[PDB]
Amino acid sequence: EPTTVAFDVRPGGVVHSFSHNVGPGDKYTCMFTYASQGGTNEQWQMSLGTSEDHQHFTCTIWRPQGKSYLYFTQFKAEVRGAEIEYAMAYSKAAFERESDVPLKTEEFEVTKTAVAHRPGAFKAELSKLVIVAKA
């Protein structure tokens, strides 16, 4: 029943996935799959929001305070069975004196169901993903 859940983003280079679902029959699903290098785990948050029209929903994945130290070698946020209407990925998110810093055009790709890194162009820094979708 919580709409927001905490999860650990783990270094070590092995691929991990974390997912959360809300709504009748887990209608609204969001999954974050990644692999990273680093010294410590990072507790991130995944929030799923639902709108009045029973169709639109949002998935927001982020690291509190907007800075991540992990070297991501891959990432993919997926909303299976849904259609993305808006999405943005950030290397750094706004906090105190820092501004949001969107990933550069070449770093990622937005398909109907996913926001994913672009192999060979992604710069490895990520701290926030925002997805607005229609179930």
Author numbering: 3 to 137
Study authors write:
MYDGF, previously named c19orf10 (chromosome 19 open reading frame 10), is a poorly characterized protein, which was identified as a paracrine-acting protein that is secreted by monocytes and macrophages. Human MYDGF has 142 amino acids and consists of an N-terminal 31-residue-long signal peptide and the MYDGF protein sequence containing a C-terminal KDEL-like ER retention sequence. Treatment with recombinant MYDGF helps to protect and repair the heart after acute MI.
Recombinant full-length MYDGF, lacking the N-terminal signal peptide, was crystallized using sitting-drop vapor diffusion methods. MYDGF crystals diffracted to 1.6 Å. Due to the lack of initial start models, the structure of MYDGF was determined by Hg-SAD phasing by derivatization of a trigonal crystal form using Hg(II)I2. The MYDGF structure consists of 10 antiparallel β-strands forming two β-sheets, which are packed face to face to each other, forming a β-sandwich. The β-strands are connected by loops of 3–18 amino acid lengths and enclose a hydrophobic interior. However, analysis of MYDGF by analytical size-exclusion chromatography clearly indicates that MYDGF is monomeric in solution.
